[model samples]
Target: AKDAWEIPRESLRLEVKLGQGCFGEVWMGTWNGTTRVAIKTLKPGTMSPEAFLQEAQVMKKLRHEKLVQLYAVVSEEPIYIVTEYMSKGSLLDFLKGEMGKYLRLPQLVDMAAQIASGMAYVERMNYVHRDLRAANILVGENLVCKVADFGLARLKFPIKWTAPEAALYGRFTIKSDVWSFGILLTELTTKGRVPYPGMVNREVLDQVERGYRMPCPPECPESLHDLMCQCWRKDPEERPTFEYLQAFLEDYFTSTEPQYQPGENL
Candidate 1:
């Protein structure tokens, strides 16, 4: 049975559909008869021309395997961007919707490591995903993680990131992304449950500031919990870089392996 990643068209085909978002339907297309592509049409007031310019500028230079590949663009009638389509859809969809609760702890940790590795690469380039939420990642088959939705991503010099005191504001910084990654990790293991689900943005921030964290779900290893706590620190400076999270989770996964072969004992 094909999952969310299954495309609705034949290979090497050009087809469009109206689906999802403030902008009109995110178009579906094909790339060279092999890879599937999603063509996102820019919504005029939904995102300004300035924002699109900045996104295109940074996206053009970004090349990461775990991040969606930006191919080309056609700005004729409606602004269109050709990108690799993640058929598995958003990470959020995996946790709460139809697919519901299919992941185990080992799988969650493995995929979380993939996300960290991708973030680490972005960190080296000094770019930050301003909106690094669970809803933005696309999880492919075999737990391949792809960071998506760059509508809010940015890069800058040394900075301390902060959120909106009241409005839905976002500040860009590697550490901020780290915090968001932490949230992503938590969501994955919890099977897509949002931390403090009913709370507003300010309430969520307040909870973090008060040293509160998402409760460790059943079957989640303690090591993962520790890492999540560090990432969700109130002060962005207190969090570890994406590289550190990658290394930490990688080691944690390795430790779970059997120490020796069946015939050979220490």
Candidate 2:
């Protein structure tokens, strides 16, 4: 059976609030004596215990190196979800910061591969990450990237990274998540640039409906851009499965030369 690990409130020591969003606030904390952790706390009365528990239950069911590992939970007021501390923080922020500019093509591709591998596992279990984005992917020491924030990800819909169909209708599926992954690839290649720059939310919706798609970053490899295009196809059926993506990425990891040709490195 899937298990939800719960931590006692008294055992957690909040050091600082790392971020705040639609879900709630995240804090850097130490658990018990030794382990540093990221604690995501929900606003009071914002989400019911049962709802939070359901999300926790899904999290507990997932266990993969590429996906954030949930350590424990606190099911009361100031409810908290504890996860392994990713020292490097969000992949988007890391890429936009000073260090990101120095990252080579291989490093960016490796991070994207890790995320794709994780999403494959999520797909295997038949779960959709409706909110996949660079901000949702956390980076750790040695540049390891892990998909995060699933604890509250299911509670709502995301606008910018959502698939066109999901944005038009309320449907969400693995394919839709793939769409978001494409946007994330753009973010990775462009050093964390926002999708549809200078366009309002309404404008984005209208443009996307008229078959407008973001162009490839000048530095993006042809293969990577092609993959992104495949992911962004208007019909969800045209999108490649995460399993296929993982296989391709794995091949890239082993190969010495660039995987995609017809472009400068990465």
Candidate 3:
């Protein structure tokens, strides 16, 4: 079952260019002239074959609704990965653009909840999304959100959304991922604003150690903000597990009230 669905390049009909990244360029395409897909072609020499294969193996095992589906892979050099097409693109771009201003609070909460649900699955599988961020979350049909870009599986990552322990000690665990999840929540609340604005990467690191954190955006609900804080606890062990986070979001969804009241000031 772990065998890759190897797709021949000739079988794909490339369409518009969707996005580009450090590792590869993603293009809108159709597989075998029927199914719409997003094709990511890795640049040669950018990643090791062993790492790529490892990532592919892990991705094949992840069969969650909120996680992006990997349809196939082109195994040769300049490797290509085929995944389901997400029409709305990255959540980062969607939230940062004008569309975010018009979104009702409930819509925002649901999107966040979907992402947390996806992460909960990854946590259960003992995998840490070292690069969790709004930019890596993709929006699809019916406003559904799916976690994308598992570059962490291939050992490539950025530091901005990283947890303090991961930055300082090279420890990447589910708890460390929880820290990044806090940053992602902040991004969503702030309409995709960059975290640690006006601060250098090293300065952001210093402030986290000094017990400073980003303030909740005014539009953010008090309960959600509190959850974000729980995720950012200095001690990774003190942070709530992803399962707990999912239940917290579920409570919000099931509440009769349309909005959450501010959690008692911590």
What are the lDDT figures for the candidates, one per model? 0.65, 0.83, 0.80
Distance from true location, Cα of 134 in model 3, Å: 0.7
Given candidate 2, what's the lDDT at residue 188? 84
Task: Name every residue pair that clashes in candidate 1.
Answer: 4-87, 5-87, 5-88, 12-33, 19-25
Residues 1-266 of candidate 2: C-alpha lDDT, one tens digit per residue: 32448668999999999888775898999999799999988888777876777777777779899999989888887788899989889998898899877877678878888999999999999888888899999998988999997536555345778998888887789999999998898888877888888888888888888998888788675667888889999999989999988777667645534454433534
* Model 2 worst lDDT run, 10 consecutive residues: 256-265
Off by over 4 Å in 3: 1-3, 151-157, 253-266
Cα lDDT of model 3 by residue, 156-175, tens digit: 34566888888889888889
Task: Give the true-structure RMSD of model 1.
Answer: 8.3
lDDT of 1 by residue, 48-162 (tens): 5444655667767778888878776543335556778776777777767666455656666677788888789889988877777677777678777888765453412111123
Question: Better model by TM-score, 1 or 3?
Answer: 3
Ranking by lDDT: 2, 3, 1
- As a TM-score, model 1 comes out at 0.77
Q: Which residue pairs does candidate 2 place in steric collision?
A: none
Query: In model 1, where do residues sit more than 4 Å from their true spots?
Result: 1-19, 31-35, 75-77, 97-100, 151-171, 256-266
Task: For each candidate, give its TM-score against the true structure.
Answer: 0.77, 0.90, 0.90
